[PDB]
Structure 1
Amino acid sequence: MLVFIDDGSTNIKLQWQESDGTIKQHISPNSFKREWAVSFGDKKVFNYTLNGEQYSFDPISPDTNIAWQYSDVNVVAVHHALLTSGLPVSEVDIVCTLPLTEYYDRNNQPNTENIERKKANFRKKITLNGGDTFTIKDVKVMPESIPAGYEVLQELDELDSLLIIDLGGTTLDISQVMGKLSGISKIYGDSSLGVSLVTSAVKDALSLARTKGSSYLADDIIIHRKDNNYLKQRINDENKISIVTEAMNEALRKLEQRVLNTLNEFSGYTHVMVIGGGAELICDAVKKHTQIRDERFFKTNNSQYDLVNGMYLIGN
């Protein structure tokens, strides 16, 4: 079994193909705490032991990004993603990830130590309380932006170029790739903002415990921000709805504000693709800004999985 895993620090995206040929996609959050969760009978808990420490999954408080890729939690979050993927527990080969400006140097040349360190990380032994864990055998690396735009690039003429805009949890990366992946025109990495900007705006708009715990609430609000029906039910307070909406919009305005300034650094692209968890949040602005024709603008309603699905399709 081969599983493609885009283990981002906000969400882990999984992709693999079944015996019947169907291609599966899964997303598991990076929400864990350094202690087992106790259950007296009604709550199903995931209690892990990674090196010596015990960990457990849970909707904790949202609080390095880079350090995380080689952390014990990363390993736990990945196994957990496997365990909750629906896949049968087994030995598995995986392909994981390390960002555009990390994979490529300043001259857009692919950039050993970090890579072997990444591989070595899944060499850590994990155990699940009252259950069995998958066995990670072989562990390939792919750049982030590119795999998501590949099936479109195949169709592009060598002279046209896809502008890929990825809005992640804590970074916004934009790249411009020549048709038929015949070259990387430009890469712009910006680790100063991501969806977490909006997330924290919501956790504050509603005095919310700044922990991964409330991240599910914050997410529901951001996602259903245009449906007052949903908002009313999720938020039992009428006053807090107008407030969260104002705070949510200023944060959104900041996102759109920046992606737009950055797009002015790119020119000559013929096609546009928006990916990442927050793709939906800046989609309209960039479409408007770039003024690219509908048939050349790419977006999906599963944006957080566009990368790992693209990776899956390439190396399946």
Structure 2
Amino acid sequence: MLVFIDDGSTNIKLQWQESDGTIKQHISPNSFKREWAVSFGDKKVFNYTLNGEQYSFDPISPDAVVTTNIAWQYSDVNVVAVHHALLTSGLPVSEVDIVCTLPLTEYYDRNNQPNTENIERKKANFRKKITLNGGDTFTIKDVKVMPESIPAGYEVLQELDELDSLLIIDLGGTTLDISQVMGKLSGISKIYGDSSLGVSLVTSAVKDALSLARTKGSSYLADDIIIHRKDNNYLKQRINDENKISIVTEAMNEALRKLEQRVLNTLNEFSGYTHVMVIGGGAELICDAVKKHTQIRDERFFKTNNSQYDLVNGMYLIGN
């Protein structure tokens, strides 16, 4: 049964429908270590035997995740993550069939032209003999593969002018792979690709300014403040002292300043923008960034509330 799993290296983003007739969205974080942290009681984990190795969930060190998007998206850690995501929602352990996501750097070349061997490479990854070490594993039978940024355009691209362009941006923890698509999917123009800076810099800098060590898996407590940067109420709760609120804000700002400092020039490098779509978790951050520089009018500037799930919705409506 088809589950749409945007298997991103920051966190995995999911959408599916069941036998009730209601559509569910879900998210499972990237937090899978190359060791077994077990549990025989209260404090409950997940543990896996992967390809031949020991894997489990704990609030992981940056070792695997702070590498590149490219390195993680085809990994054994990605195999843990996708099968973990279906267990964090809690689906009936049996089949899945999946849609999964590729970088644009990996999908499209020097001429920005495509590679299907990299499509089969994801399917080959999700062919490894993973056991849930306390249950059994969802069997991924059929596999569709898409790139990351592009499929978000799908539902909007329907009406959109076929000679004009839709510039589609994921800003992630890792991902900064960007596509210039054309309307109705008449073609694709130019791509840009990067994962050298992102929200992982921002969210980790907030941990330092708080009271928390530089791991991934306790990310929420810092991710909170990246979300509520437009507030001060949840900031006063979570950054629980006024004397720390500047420190956290200016640490966050140091990262965000230097994120803006590249991505605005990336949208100078992308000549021929006409419509803009902003997606991902950092969609909110690039909305605050790129709108004031690009100066495209709001009828051609797309970003919802959901932000990261905007991507997996465009994937969903292709075929379940």
Q: Which consecutive residues of structure 1, in runs of 5 or more, have no partner in the other structure? A: none
State the secondary structure of the residue aligned to 2:178: strand
Cα distance change of structure 1 residues 212 and 114 upon mapping to structure 2, 3 Å threshold:
same
The 2-side partners of 1:41 and 1:112 are apart by 45
Cα distance change of structure 1 residues 171 and 38 upon mapping to structure 2, 3 Å threshold:
closer
The 2-side partners of 1:89 and 1:41 are apart by 22
Measured against aligned partners, the alpha-carbon deviations of 1:133-175 in whole angstroms (never above 9, x if no partner) come to 2112222221222200121111112122111122122232222
CA positional deviation for 1:119:
1.6
Q: Is the 8 A contact 1:203 1:214 kept in 2?
A: no
Cα distance change of structure 1 residues 295 and 116 upon mapping to structure 2, 3 Å threshold:
closer
CA positional deviation for 1:112:
4.9
State the secondary structure of the residue aligned to 2:241: coil
Q: Is the 8 A contact 1:62 1:214 kept in 2?
A: no
CA positional deviation for 1:53:
2.7
The 2-side partners of 1:269 and 1:72 are apart by 37
The 2-side partners of 1:107 and 1:57 are apart by 40
CA positional deviation for 1:213:
3.0
Query: Normalising by structure 1, what TM-score?
Result: 0.91
**Is the deviation greater in 234-243 or in 107-116?**
107-116
Q: Is the 8 A contact 2:6 2:13 kept in 1?
A: yes
Cα distance change of structure 1 residues 69 and 284 upon mapping to structure 2, 3 Å threshold:
closer
State the secondary structure of the residue aligned to 1:240: helix
The 2-side partners of 1:96 and 1:300 are apart by 22
Q: Is the 8 A contact 1:172 1:191 kept in 2?
A: yes
The 2-side partners of 1:276 and 1:136 are apart by 25
CA positional deviation for 1:109:
2.1
The equivalences for 1:91-170 within 5 A come to: 91-170=95-174
Match of residue 54 from structure 1: 54
Q: Is the 8 A contact 1:61 1:209 kept in 2?
A: no
Match of residue 11 from structure 2: 11
**Is the deviation greater in 4-13 or in 220-229?**
220-229
**Is the deviation greater in 19-28 or in 240-249?**
19-28
**Is the deviation greater in 151-160 or in 31-40?**
31-40
CA positional deviation for 1:11:
1.1
State the secondary structure of the residue aligned to 2:266: helix
Measured against aligned partners, the alpha-carbon deviations of 1:152-207 in whole angstroms (never above 9, x if no partner) come to 11111212211112212223222222111111122111232111121232123235
**Is the deviation greater in 109-118 or in 234-243?**
109-118
Q: Is residue 2:291 matched to residue 1:287? A: yes
Q: Is the 8 A contact 1:31 1:212 kept in 2?
A: yes
CA positional deviation for 1:130:
3.2
Measured against aligned partners, the alpha-carbon deviations of 1:198-246 in whole angstroms (never above 9, x if no partner) come to 1232123235311123322221121123332212222333322210111
Cα distance change of structure 1 residues 33 and 265 upon mapping to structure 2, 3 Å threshold:
same
Cα distance change of structure 1 residues 186 and 241 upon mapping to structure 2, 3 Å threshold:
same
User: How many pairs does the alignment contain?
Assistant: 316
The 2-side partners of 1:151 and 1:237 are apart by 44
Match of residue 37 from structure 2: 37
Cα distance change of structure 1 residues 117 and 184 upon mapping to structure 2, 3 Å threshold:
closer
Match of residue 185 from structure 1: 189
Q: Is the 8 A contact 2:106 2:118 kept in 1?
A: no
Q: Is the 8 A contact 1:36 1:47 kept in 2?
A: yes
CA positional deviation for 1:84:
1.6
Cα distance change of structure 1 residues 48 and 286 upon mapping to structure 2, 3 Å threshold:
same
The 1-side partners of 2:288 and 2:121 are apart by 39
CA positional deviation for 1:40:
5.4
The 1-side partners of 2:62 and 2:97 are apart by 31
The 1-side partners of 2:56 and 2:308 are apart by 24
Aligned-residue sequence identity (percent) comes to 100
Cα distance change of structure 1 residues 10 and 299 upon mapping to structure 2, 3 Å threshold:
same
**Is the deviation greater in 143-152 or in 212-221?**
212-221
Q: Is the 8 A contact 2:70 2:103 kept in 1?
A: no
The 2-side partners of 1:180 and 1:305 are apart by 21
The 2-side partners of 1:68 and 1:161 are apart by 30
The 1-side partners of 2:182 and 2:75 are apart by 35
The 2-side partners of 1:281 and 1:149 are apart by 19
Cα distance change of structure 1 residues 38 and 99 upon mapping to structure 2, 3 Å threshold:
closer
Q: Is the 8 A contact 2:30 2:217 kept in 1?
A: no
Cα distance change of structure 1 residues 129 and 191 upon mapping to structure 2, 3 Å threshold:
closer
Two-structure CA RMSD over aligned residues (Å) = 2.1
Q: Is the 8 A contact 1:92 1:134 kept in 2?
A: yes
Q: Which consecutive residues of structure 2, in runs of 5 or more, have no partner in the other structure? A: none
**Is the deviation greater in 57-66 or in 24-33?**
57-66
Q: Is the 8 A contact 1:61 1:214 kept in 2?
A: no
Q: Is the 8 A contact 2:4 2:15 kept in 1?
A: yes
Measured against aligned partners, the alpha-carbon deviations of 1:263-299 in whole angstroms (never above 9, x if no partner) come to 1123333321101121111202211222222222111
Q: Is the 8 A contact 2:108 2:114 kept in 1?
A: yes
Query: Normalising by structure 2, what TM-score?
Result: 0.90
